[PDB]
């Protein structure tokens, strides 16, 4: 995907990753909250590594751009 899909991306799983948290109310039951925290751990362990995808993306057009422009 793209800069512009990667952005979609990761808002999406922040998304996700509230609307799963917010789930995890203190009336539910103990195992099943269990897993609950298990599975947001798992989406935000995505988002960071989605938002490393950004930064890689971003970083290198910005680098290139300062190479050609350091040349001669």
């Known amino acids: ?32 909250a269990a897993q609950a925290v298990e599975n947001v751990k798992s989406i935000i362990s995505e988002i960071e590594s989605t938002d490393e995808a950004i930064a890689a993306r971003r970083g290198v057009s910005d680098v290139t751009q300062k190479l050609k422009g350091l040349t001669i």
Request: net charge negative; proline share 3%.
């Open 1 to 32: 995907m793209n800069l512009k899909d990667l952005l979609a991306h990761r808002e999406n799983l922040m998304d996700s990753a509230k609307r799963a948290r917010s789930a995890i109310t203190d009336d539910m039951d103990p195992a099943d």
